[PDB]
Amino acid sequence: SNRTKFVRSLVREIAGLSPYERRL
Amino acid sequence: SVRKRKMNRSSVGKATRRNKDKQRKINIQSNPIIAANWDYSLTMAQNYKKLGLRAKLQTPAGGKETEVVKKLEELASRSQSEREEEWLEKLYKKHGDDYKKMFFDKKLNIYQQSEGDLKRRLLRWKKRNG
Amino acid sequence: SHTLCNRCGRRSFHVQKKTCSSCGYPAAKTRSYNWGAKAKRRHTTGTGRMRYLKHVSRRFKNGFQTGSASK
Amino acid sequence: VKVHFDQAGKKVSRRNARATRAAKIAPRPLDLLRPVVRAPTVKYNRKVRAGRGFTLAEVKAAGLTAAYARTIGIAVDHRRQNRNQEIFDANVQRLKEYQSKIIVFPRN
Amino acid sequence: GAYKYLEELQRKKQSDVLRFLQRVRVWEYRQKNVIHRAARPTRPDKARRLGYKAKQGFVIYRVRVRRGRSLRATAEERVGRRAANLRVLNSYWVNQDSTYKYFEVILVDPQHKAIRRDARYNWICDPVHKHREARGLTATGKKSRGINKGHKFNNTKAGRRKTWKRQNTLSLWRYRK
Amino acid sequence: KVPPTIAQFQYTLDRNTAAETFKLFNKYRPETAAEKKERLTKEAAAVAASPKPYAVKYGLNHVVALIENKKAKLVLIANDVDPIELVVFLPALCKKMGVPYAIVKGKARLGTLVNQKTSAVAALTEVRDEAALAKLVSTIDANFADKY
Amino acid sequence: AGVKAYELRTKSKEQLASQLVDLKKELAELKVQKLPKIKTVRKSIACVLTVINEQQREAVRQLYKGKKYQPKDLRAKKTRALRRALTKFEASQVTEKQRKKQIAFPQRKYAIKA
Amino acid sequence: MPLTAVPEPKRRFVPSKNEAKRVMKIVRAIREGRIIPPKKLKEMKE
RNA sequence: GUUUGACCUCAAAUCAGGUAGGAGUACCCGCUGAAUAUCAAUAAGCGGAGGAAAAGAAACCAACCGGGAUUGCCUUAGUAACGCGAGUGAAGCGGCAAAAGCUCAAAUUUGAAAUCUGGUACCUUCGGUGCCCGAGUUGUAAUUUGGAGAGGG
RNA sequence: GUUCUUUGUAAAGUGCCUUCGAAGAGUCGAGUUGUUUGGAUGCAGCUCUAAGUGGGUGGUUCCAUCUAAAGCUAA
RNA sequence: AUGGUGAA
Ligand SMILES: [Zn+2]
């Protein structure tokens, strides 16, 4: 679903990167 | 038990209930035709066969239409609101049978009913009244 | 050592411990154990008057009806 | 150690329950029409047996809906698929016979 | 709906925003009693998907349990013991730290006429549902009981004690087989 | 000192523009329970063709349904919602959809104009007065988005 | 022997109280002697007290006529478990969707012969 | 472009059916004589 | 405003309407639990329900021309498997008993929070109505629970 | 069976055409430590922590079957 | 071994 993908991208941009993700 | 002995010794008396015989006897309570023809002397399967009906649809385990006519004979035994009628009459007077024109009536077709619904309602009104 | 107990009167109320070894007074629960089969029987329901439990069975038989006979 | 002394008692109780159901369910046969099923486990695949309920495709091919079929005494199972034309045809024929033999009283 | 956004945000549990929210909320709760009445849930999406509804009859309680009988089971038992007149339906995790773990439990009062007349919720008013957490009938209790389908739960599909009794009994018919 | 996604609140519309927005919103107060009940009773008595009503949209779920459809023109967001996660993403959603948004202090103040004790958000879709709404939107943009 | 309840039903509160006082005085006088009449007067006292209590209870019921939440004394004594176990109306409550489904497809009565 | 779907229902372009249902319920109540119109309430205020 | 209001939070009242302990305990559910393999998920102990309890409509069983809620019996079977030693020990398929499917989260009623608790006066009183009070917008009703489902013709 | 009511431009179903078409995260999962099983599974303290034509269960390139992390329900 | 009793 396009709406679900958009919501996921919005949440990804809002939440930033996790502490373990920041290591990348 | 202690309670049973106390109850037996007590003068209150037992609340006797005799219903063993009533377990064997069951009266039909879902059909008037069957009740008149049903015979409690025979079993469920025997009664169904006597009436001419099937008591089981699947192959039963273990070894094994004078009445159905009455059941078949037993098989042979909405309008519009006043405001709805007035609304239909208004549109009929304003547009007659012009369904397409009636559809676009902004101040009489308050509810945007389809052409099919409008024509069906008008036909029902005509049949009921004229 | 022991004294009369208000709940049971079994004369098993410890003076120093201020508790009854038989019925468990003042504990809300009544002391009882499975291994004490004879003890349970001695204090099982029905050993007393059963002022209210007696009429429950009779009342149920009538469906807990209320009112009076129509004569 | 349990001894089935009640075997006769259990049978009598089951018969009494069936009689009570018949008294309440006199007009109906107490059973829902079941489809024919071919078993897995080739040791038993040769044996055909009754199933839980007819598939949605079979009910549709029988000229009735599952919701209406249930009220007429037809078991419906939406979990079973269809992969055999012979079984589908047999189930359709059984449903057609059931529809042609059932009598429904008016709701009026 | 917004609840999808809430669920997606809650998916990234280790986000710096959720970290700040959790560390603020745990500190705020640290100044309150172990068990206290909650005005409203802090995770509306989780409660809503768990069956909670904002109507007269529902109650939200927050309980703190020592870290290290699961923690959720202990919380449910404690709230049921304290809320004797209410029935525990479900609970969800809301916070954790190095010392304590916090869970939120939603309760429904069967005495309120709103629940009694609610066709979708009056089922809990039956006496057989008394103290669901006590018998492990809650979601956490059932999960801890191993109740599920498949080979992975054959020995605990329905009753770990029942199977032992069944396999230890000696069934003898009137006519020996 | 908090993550940038937080502390976007505490920067809010100024007193003058906030008062102007509240005055504009008060015009479209939804018919309260008593007013709607009495109007419906009057209509029934008269019965015993209609213009579309205009009112503010305040339900968070309803507003979010209107948001992302690009129908909402101006949305007010309370900065004191206890479940902050309910409103952390709303400004970003509005920015992505290009819908102007304004953070107004006090959920109670936001709800006082919609006949409710509290209201997390409020949004306008239809208007009576379009020039006033456009001017208010431009002022809010220039005073909030271009500054913070 | 003794007083008849069916005669005392229509007596007023003051008359019943006076009769009870007279019976109590008679019992006190007879106690000094220490005699079946003592049993008769004792039974009459109980009958008068029961009649007075019955009158008072019906008066209390009348004053609470029809209004909700009557005193627990007048409420049903069936059992603790029956006050729970939601009443017939609550149990019969059904969602609109289920009612619509039942109306659309009610359970039909049928037989299978032809 | 908007992300949603399910094009606009007719009710959004038509007067609410709930309002009509409430009006007809009030009309039924008035017919049964259990509701007094506000105009009659003004007279009864005496 | 050297003030007056909206809420939110926290306390109290011999406040109004409610429920909780405990008893019994053969069966049910959970926790704990002896005399590294064995007596053993036994004995004992604690907590929680009913006339039954639990479970229950698959992130199932199978590798077949497939079956289709849970539960009990025979069979599978003293087999597979394990501890290969004394010993423990399943489950699918098959036949039988009885069969019933459903409810929320999820996409706008926004052209009308349409929902519900309580108070008051009546009536046809296990409830209904007019009015008021409060909850609800941080979501109460209808519409959908994957068998798809929804706006229209 | 008997008797009063319905109504309101009210609620559903059938076949066709058309435009859309959501899915339980400190959860699955791996690690380790206690526990149960004749099952190697499950239960349980804790570091980490998953994706949406995705995920779970089974074998010779993968093919077969469902959609867990909510709940109710007589026999 | 389990659960209790009294005893400084
Ligand atoms: Zn004692």
Q: How would DSSP label each residue in G36-96?
A: THHHHHHHHHHHHHHHHHHHHHHHHHHHTSS-SS--TTTS--S-HHHHSS--HHHHH---H
Burial code (b: 16+ CB inside 10 Å, e: under 16) for F74-83 equals: bbbbbbebeb
C-alpha E165/C-alpha E147 separation (Å) is 18
Angle F16-F20-F26 from CA coordinates, rounded to 5°: 145
How many CB atoms sit inside 10 A of residue D92's CB? 19
Residues 6+ apart with CB under 8 A from F125: F57, F66, F71, F72, F73
**Which residue, among H8, F91, C63, has the nearest Cα to E5 in the 3D structure?**
F91
- Report yes or no: F89 and E5 within 8 Å, Cβ to Cβ: yes
Do residues G77 and G99 share a domain? Answer: yes
- Report yes or no: A14 and F88 within 8 Å, Cβ to Cβ: yes
- Report yes or no: D107 and D45 within 8 Å, Cβ to Cβ: no
Helix spans in chain D (H): 7-24, 56-61, 66-71, 85-101
Instruction: Point out the nucleotide closest to H23 (alpha carbon to C1′).
Output: J8
- Report yes or no: D79 and D35 within 8 Å, Cβ to Cβ: no
Determine the angle formed by the axes of helices F90-97 and A2-15, rounding to 10 degrees: 120
- Three-state DSSP state, D3: strand
- Report yes or no: E56 and E41 within 8 Å, Cβ to Cβ: no
Q: Give the distance, in angstroms, between the CA of residue G91 and the centroid of all CA atoms in the same chain.
A: 27
Helical (H) or strand (E) element with C56? helix C53-61
Residues 6+ apart with CB under 8 A from C28: none
- Three-state DSSP state, G105: coil
Which structure tokens are listed for F98? 């290009």
Do residues G22 and G77 share a domain? Answer: no
- The amino acid present at F99, given as its one-letter code, is V
Q: Which of E2, E20, E21 sits opposite F64 (nearest CB)?
A: E2
How many CB atoms sit inside 10 A of residue B107's CB? 7
- Report yes or no: F79 and F103 within 8 Å, Cβ to Cβ: yes
- Three-state DSSP state, D14: helix
Residue of C nearest to B6 (CA): C46
- Report yes or no: B115 and B103 within 8 Å, Cβ to Cβ: yes
Which residues of chain B does H10 touch, with a Cβ-Cβ cutoff of 8 Å? Answer: 112
- Chains touching A by CB (3 or more pairs below 8 Å): E, F, H
Do residues G81 and G43 share a domain? Answer: no
C55 annotated to bind ligand: no
* B114 close contact with G: CB closer than 8 A: no
Which structure tokens are listed for B19? 């219903």
In order of A11, D76, E14, F99, F137, the CA distances from F91 in angstroms are 12, 50, 21, 9, 15
In order of B50, D89, G55, the CA distances from D96 in angstroms are 25, 10, 72
**Which residue, among F101, F131, F146, has the nearest Cα to F24 in the 3D structure?**
F131
In order of B59, D28, H25, the CA distances from H21 in angstroms are 54, 41, 6
How many CB atoms sit inside 10 A of residue F145's CB? 13
**Quick one: DSSP state of residue B52?**
T
**Which residue, among F58, F37, F66, has the nearest Cα to F118 in the 3D structure?**
F58
Do residues G82 and G107 share a domain? Answer: yes
Rg (Cα) of chain A, in Å, rounded? Answer: 11
Which residues of chain E does F89 touch, with a Cβ-Cβ cutoff of 8 Å? Answer: 5, 9
Q: Chains F vs H: touching, with 3+ CB pairs under 8 Å? A: yes
Residue of E nearest to A19 (CA): E14
| Count of domains forming chain G | 2
Angle F125-F131-F136 from CA coordinates, rounded to 5°: 70
Do residues G63 and G78 share a domain? Answer: no
Total residues belonging to chain C: 71
Q: Distance in angstroms, CA of H36 to C1' of I133?
A: 21
F122 burial via Cβ count (<10 Å: 0-12, 13-18, 19+): buried
- Report yes or no: B56 and G112 within 8 Å, Cβ to Cβ: no
Q: Is the CB of C56 under 7 A from strand I?
A: no
Residues, CB-to-ion distance under 5 Å, ligand 1: C 5, 7-8, 20, 23, 25
Instruction: Give the structural domain span for G92.
Output: 69-114
Would you call E174 and D7 a contact, using CB atoms and an 8 Å cutoff?
A: yes
* G6 close contact with C: CB closer than 8 A: no
- Three-state DSSP state, C26: coil
- Report yes or no: E78 and E28 within 8 Å, Cβ to Cβ: no
Give the neighbor-by-neighbor strand order of the sheet with E87-96. E35-38, E58-66, E100-108, E87-96
Angle B32-B34-B38 from CA coordinates, rounded to 5°: 130
Do residues G17 and G40 share a domain? Answer: yes
Residues 6+ apart with CB under 8 A from G78: C59, C64
Q: Distance in angstroms, CA of F111 to C1' of J45?
A: 47
C12 annotated to bind ligand: no
Total residues belonging to chain H: 46
Which structure tokens are listed for B116? 């099919």
**Quick one: DSSP state of residue F124?**
E
Residues 6+ apart with CB under 8 A from E74: E65
Do residues G2 and G29 share a domain? Answer: yes
Do residues G29 and G15 share a domain? Answer: yes
Do residues G59 and G87 share a domain? Answer: no
Do residues G109 and G54 share a domain? Answer: no
- Chains touching B by CB (3 or more pairs below 8 Å): C, D, F, G, H
Dihedrals phi, psi of D50, to nearest 5 degrees: -70, 145
Q: Is the CB of C1 under 7 A from strand K?
A: yes
Burial code (b: 16+ CB inside 10 Å, e: under 16) for E82-94 equals: ebeebbbbbbbeb
Residue reference for tokens 């329901």: C45
- Report yes or no: G56 and G71 within 8 Å, Cβ to Cβ: no
Residues 6+ apart with CB under 8 A from E83: E59, E61, E107
**Quick one: DSSP state of residue F119?**
-
- Three-state DSSP state, D2: strand
* B21 close contact with H: CB closer than 8 A: no
Q: Work out the widest C-alpha separation in chain E, in whole angstroms.
A: 73
Q: Give the distance, in angstroms, between the CA of residue D105 and the centroid of all CA atoms in the same chain.
A: 21
Which residues of chain F does B107 touch, with a Cβ-Cβ cutoff of 8 Å? Answer: 49
* C4 close contact with G: CB closer than 8 A: no
- Nucleotides of strand I within 7 Å of the protein's CB atoms: 5-10, 16-26, 28-32, 41-50, 52-56, 58-75, 89-123, 125-127, 129-145, 147-153
**Which residue, among E99, E106, E100, E93, has the nearest Cα to E18 in the 3D structure?**
E93
Q: Is the CB of H28 under 7 A from strand I?
A: no
- Chains touching H by CB (3 or more pairs below 8 Å): A, B, F
* H45 close contact with F: CB closer than 8 A: no
| Count of domains forming chain E | 1
Domain CATH code at residue G85:
6.10.250.3450
Instruction: Give the structural domain span for E151.
Output: 1-177
Q: Distance in angstroms, CA of B18 to C1' of I53?
A: 29
Domain CATH code at residue E54:
3.40.1120.10
C23 annotated to bind ligand: yes
Per-residue HEC secondary structure of H2-41 comes to: CCCCCCCCHHHHCCCHHHHHHHHHHHHHHHHCCCCCHHHH
Q: Which domains does chain F have, with CATH numbers?
A: 1-148 (3.30.1330.30)
Residue of H nearest to B114 (CA): H10
Would you call D1 and E170 a contact, using CB atoms and an 8 Å cutoff?
A: yes
DSSP per residue, chain E? -HHHHHHHHHH-TT-HHHHHHHHHHHHHHHTS-SEEEESS-S-HHHHHHTT--SSBTEEEEEEEEE----HHHHHHHHHHHH-TTSEEEEEEEEEE-SSEEEEEEEEE-TTSHHHHT-TTTGGGGSGGGTTTTTTT-SHHHHHHTT--SSGGGGGGSS-HHHHHHHHH--EE-SS--
How many CB atoms sit inside 10 A of residue E145's CB? 16
Pairing of strands F74-78, F101-104: parallel
C-alpha G42/C-alpha E97 separation (Å) is 77
User: Closest protein residue to J39 using CA and C1' atoms?
Assistant: E155
Residues 19-38 of C with CB under 7 A from strand K: 19, 21, 33, 35
**Which residue, among E59, E70, E69, E71, has the nearest Cα to E95 in the 3D structure?**
E71
> E57 — alpha (psi -120 to 50), left (phi > 0) or beta?
left
C-alpha B52/C-alpha B66 separation (Å) is 8
Do residues G50 and G2 share a domain? Answer: yes
How many CB atoms sit inside 10 A of residue G54's CB? 13
* C27 close contact with B: CB closer than 8 A: no
DSSP per residue, F80-98? --SSTHHHHSHHHHHHHHT
Q: Chains C vs G: touching, with 3+ CB pairs under 8 Å? A: yes
- Report yes or no: F24 and F136 within 8 Å, Cβ to Cβ: yes
Would you call H10 and B112 a contact, using CB atoms and an 8 Å cutoff?
A: yes
Q: Chains D vs C: touching, with 3+ CB pairs under 8 Å? A: no
- The amino acid present at H35, given as its one-letter code, is I
C-alpha F14/C-alpha F26 separation (Å) is 18
C-alpha G17/C-alpha E113 separation (Å) is 45
Dihedrals phi, psi of A14, to nearest 5 degrees: -70, -45
Strand partners for E35: E63
